[PDB]
């Protein structure tokens, strides 16, 4: 079973990042909102390259998510279904397996949404630009970024971002850096 700490990390991500219209379930309509929000944030032209690519990528991610979590096949993922899926995913990451492919795709999507300069590094300004748009206070973006980059000793490359992303979802260690990947947690 997920510890309180894991369960709460996994709920907080459902609630802030996936359920964009905040009604308590994840559907395709949420991903339609997530596309609008990222288009607004970055000033992408509707039906331009980035927009059409974001839509295609998120379709694949939603499809893999529903496949894993949508037990009653109603095209909606409730918190119950999301927690049931996560308890099984975490067990498996511990037994040695990679996270599900919809989750890695979503990690790579969010990496590139952050890295608007395209140099393979998320810098402090890129990071706070994205997380502040989800309601993360700026001081929790800046404190998170220093934690994640080990105060500048580590560049937040796609690979670092991917390893921190797995740690956020599975770690039971309160000390883990990836706990703060989505804004500092007070622990
Ligand atoms: Ca929703
Ligand atoms: Ca369902
Ligand atoms: Ca960059």
TrEMBL record:
Superkingdom, taxonomy of origin: Eukaryota
Keyword Metal-binding (UniProt): yes
Binding sites annotated in the UniProt record for Ca(2+) 3: 115, 117, 119, 121, 123, 126
Binding-site list for Ca(2+) 1: 19, 21, 23, 25, 30
Molecular function via GO: metal ion binding
Sorted UniProt keywords: Calcium, Metal-binding
Name by which UniProt lists this protein: Calexcitin
Organism: Doryteuthis pealeii (Longfin inshore squid)
PROSITE patterns from the UniProt entry: EF_HAND_1
Residues reported to bind Ca(2+) 2: 70, 72, 74, 76, 81
InterPro entries cross-referenced by the UniProt entry: EF-hand-dom_pair, EF_Hand_1_Ca_BS
